């Protein structure tokens, strides 16, 4: 017998000791080697409750990533609370690596393997493991990149669909690739390419899933209504450079019911001055490096917020929202929980 419990986890990874790459260096000092023969015990006739929206593992992953970014992605100038801090900003090698989160002795991680599991409630197929799967710490807004895919059908996850303030995580079941590039020889101008045939098909599917939860109402996509560039644009980090991309074209109502079947190209820009996602002030990094910078990633999830209102209409409007970068972690950790044995 066991009970739900919190404790400090540790990490394991396949970090390379010979790498100068920044995720590798960090993990070399903060994590241990992985287990080549991981143990997983499936529990027959065991039912456990999970709540992805109340999981301290999510909180724990954030602290690690903050520490990692604080040691590595140091800026040329750092502006926080009215003061100016300068401390060199060398270019780094940056490419997220998978990190496993593990329980110490006297604890274990229960893992929900129930397909189409929405993240809250009972799970019928439960197994026990010492460590999670390898989770890449991809920091992004609007679109979840390089994450894990839904195992069956697309899953809509929310702490409370009725509550417009709770962020909706759409967990996709098929990887639509996004190809972003800043071509060699305005050095800060960039763009992302997405297969319009694949994407519009999937977006159409998301509408159908949303219809099941919202009584078959008309689903409308709209651009973000306001805020900092990190939220109104799709922001992420590519090869050390901070990309900001206009996703207006991705959430095109027209293609959800001709003309668009081609390649979709979003305008992007690399910024040197960024509002740090850790929530403080501004940070200035060096100008983008030279040559062709390219990262191809899978969109594996979408973060949405639904519009609030006291109207009596038949439509619901959705915008690529988000909130805490922690939500990104929730989408991957939703199937895990820590318990203390006896």
């Amino acid at each position, epitope marked *: 017998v066991w009970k739900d419990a919190d404790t400090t986890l540790f990490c394991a990874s396949d970090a390379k000791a010979h790498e100068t790459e920044v995720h590798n260096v960090w993990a070399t000092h903060a994590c241990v080697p992985t287990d080549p023969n991981p143990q997983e015990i499936h529990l027959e006739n065991v039912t456990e409750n999970f709540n992805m929206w109340k999981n301290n593992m999510v909180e724990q992953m954030q602290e690690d990533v903050i520490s990692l970014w604080d040691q590595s992605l140091q800026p040329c100038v750092k502006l926080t609370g009215g003061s100016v801090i300068k401390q060199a900003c060398p270019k780094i090698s940056f490419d997220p690596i998978p990190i496993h989160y593990c329980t110490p002795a006297g604890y274990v991680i229960l893992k929900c393997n129930d397909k189409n599991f929405n993240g809250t409630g009972p799970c019928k197929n439960v197994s026990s493991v010492q460590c999670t799967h390898g989770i890449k710490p991809v920091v992004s807004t609007q679109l979840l990149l390089n994450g894990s895919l839904a195992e069956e059908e697309i899953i809509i996850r929310s702490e409370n669909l009725t509550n417009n*303030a709770k962020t909706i995580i759409v967990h996709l079941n098929k990887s639509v690739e996004i190809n972003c590039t800043r071509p060699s020889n305005d050095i800060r101008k960039a763009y992302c390419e997405i297969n319009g045939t694949k994407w519009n098909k999937v977006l159409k599917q998301v509408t159908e899933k949303l219809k099941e939860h919202f009584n078959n109402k008309t689903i409308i996509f709209q651009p973000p*209504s306001g805020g900092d560039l990190e939220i109104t644009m799709h922001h992420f980090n590519c090869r050390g450079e901070f990309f900001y991309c206009n996703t207006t074209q991705l959430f095109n109502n027209t293609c959800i019911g001709k003309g668009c079947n081609g390649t979709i190209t979003l305008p992007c820009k690399i910024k040197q001055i960024i509002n740090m996602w850790q*929530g403080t002030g501004q940070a200035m990094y060096a100008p983008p490096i030279d040559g062709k910078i390219n990262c191809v990633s899978n969109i594996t999830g979408i973060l949405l917020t639904r*519009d*609030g209102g*006291a109207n009596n209409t038949s439509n619901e409007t959705f915008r690529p929202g988000g909130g*805490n970068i922690k939500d990104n972690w929730r989408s991957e950790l939703y199937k895990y929980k820590v318990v203390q044995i006896e």
Partner: antibody
């Protein structure tokens, strides 16, 4: 003690624009979403929207299409609202509200013990 | 979405006022008191939980898709108008006004 001080009242003409401000204090500013409530004299409190001091993302009410904007200043700890397309139906009192709680990184709540005094906006020819 | 009734109550200082409010969803519900010209003030929330400074003469209660605020021995400041709230929506209200 949580304190929300809104700007003074004012008079406007059909088609003008107002910026009602709300200076917050007594709490950690970022940890709490802020909401905006209007109230036409003789009407149920109509919800305008909320804003997140963290990012700045805003959730406008659908019943008021393109008649508002919300911004914030994380340093001076103050929220703003711009009433545009001023009409007869925009004559109301506007409130700046913060939720109870929290002990959480973001506070969404929807439970409102802390109100501003409100702002009188009278729009007439 | 939210049906609040009645619209008005004409009661005397000392009597008991009862204000009801219907709901379509089953989320938590709160009560606010608004004295004339003043800002609203929290009284009840989460169904029946009492707010700070609020005396036990007030009492929230839930039944089916219905919530009820009951006030005993009306005390001058108890007069005004009360609103039921669920999430972003608000009830039409009920003006508790003094009637001798």
């Amino acid at each position: 003690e949580v304190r929300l001080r809104q700007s003074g009242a004012g008079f406007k003409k059909p088609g003008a624009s107002v910026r009602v401000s709300c200076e917050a204090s007594g709490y950690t500013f970022i940890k709490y979403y802020l909401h905006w409530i209007r109230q036409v004299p003789g009407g149920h409190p109509e919800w305008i929207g909320w804003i997140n001091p963290r990012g700045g993302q805003v959730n406008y009410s659908r019943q008021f299409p393109g008649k508002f904007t919300m911004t914030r200043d994380t340093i001076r700890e103050t929220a703003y609202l711009d009433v545009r397309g001023l009409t007869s139906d925009d004559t109301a009192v506007y409130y700046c509200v913060r939720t109870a709680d929290c002990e959480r990184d973001p506070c969404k709540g929807w439970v409102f013990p802390h109100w501003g005094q409100g702002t009188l906006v009278i729009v007439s020819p | 979405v939210l049906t609040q009734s009645p619209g008005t109550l004409s009661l005397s200082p000392g009597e008991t006022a009862i204000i009801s409010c219907r709901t379509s969803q089953y989320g938590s519900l709160a009560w606010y008191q608004q004295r004339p010209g003043q800002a609203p003030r929290l009284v009840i929330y989460s169904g029946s939980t009492r707010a700070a400074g609020i005396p036990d003469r007030f009492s929230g209660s839930r039944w089916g898709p219905d919530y009820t605020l009951t006030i005993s021995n009306l005390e001058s400041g108890d007069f005004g108008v009360y609103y039921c709230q669920q999430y972003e929506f608000f009830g039409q209200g009920t003006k508790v006004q003094v009637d001798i």
